[model samples]
Each structure stands twice: as C-alpha cells, then as structure tokens.
Target: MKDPIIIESYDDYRYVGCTGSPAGSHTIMWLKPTVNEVARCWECGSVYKLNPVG
Candidate 1:
C-alpha cells in the first residue's frame, strides 16, 4: 500500500472519523496520520482501522 497522503487518509468517514482528536471530532489534521502509521484516538481512545475501499 502506498503512503497515502492527507487526502487519502482524510476524506470523510473513511480513515479520519475518530472523535478523539483534540482539534475536533471530525477533524483530520488533528489525527496527524503518517505513512504506514497506527494510532489510537486521543480523546475517545478508540482505534479506528482503515478498512479497504472497493
């Protein structure tokens, strides 16, 4: 898998749908997704896996 850019990891409820970011619930920048990165929500503390899209 390619190191998806912010656009890839952040496009609605795909990968940036966690409500834990200190910035905002639906915020993507707050998540700060990196290449091949795995992280848990900061506020909600819920780990959201990026399921493959058809």
Candidate 2:
C-alpha cells in the first residue's frame, strides 16, 4: 500500500460541495486512522473517498 498524503496541517485541505451550492461546500474535519477510508462531511453526512494522486 502507498503512504497516505501527508498534509502538513489541517488547513492544507479544502472542501467544496459536490453540488454547485455555495452554502453546501464544507471542509472535511475528521479523519479515520485506517487508510483508504472515506472522509465524511460533518454537516451534510456525505462520505468522500480518497483517490491516489498521479
């Protein structure tokens, strides 16, 4: 398995809504210890999976 993307800080990550709503876009705050786990949205209960970078 590959190493997780090392974000120097939480501020490095930004979130936007899957839809085109300005108010819906939000950042993912919590992360699970397991690799390849989906990060969830705190407000909308949406789950986003991590993809490998080229």
Candidate 3:
C-alpha cells in the first residue's frame, strides 16, 4: 500500500474543540495514545481507530 496521511498527533490537543453536534459532525480533536485512536467530540466520546505507529 501507500503511506498513511499524518492527520494529527493524538497527544497534541489540550481541549475538545468539537463544537459540532453531539451525534453529528466531529470537529474536536482528542488522542488515545501517541498516534493511534482519536475522539471527535467530548460529549459523544466518539473514538476512531487508526493504523499502528511505524
């Protein structure tokens, strides 16, 4: 395959900027580890899995 897009570091955000809907578009940014899982909103706690670190 091809190289994965470096979206954003999971440990970079300090607050939940997801000002969108609680069950809609995810705008906030949150990290589970260093470069793995991420949550879109603080209210929904919507987490998404990512590729393993290199």
**Index of the highest-lDDT prediction:** 1
User: How many backbone clashes does every candidate have?
Assistant: 0, 0, 1
Model 1 lDDT tens row, 1-54? 233223254333344654455456654434433434544656666554442332
In model 1, the Cα lDDT at residue 32 comes to 38
Give lDDT: candidate 3, residue 1.
13
For residue 47, give model 1's deviation from the true position in Å.
Answer: 0.5
* Model 3: per-residue Cα lDDT over 1-54, one tens digit each: 132223333344323333344455655555442233344435555443334433
Residue 11 C-alpha lDDT in model 3: 43
Every candidate's lDDT: 0.44, 0.40, 0.40
Please provide TM-scores, in order, for all candidate models, with all chains considered together: 0.34, 0.34, 0.24
lDDT for each residue of candidate 2 in 6-50, tens digit (9 for 90 to 100): 322233343333421246455534543223444554565555544
What's the lDDT for candidate 2? 0.40
RMSD of 3: 7.4
Instruction: State the local distance difference test value for candidate 3.
Output: 0.40
Model 3: how far is 12 from its true place, Å?
14
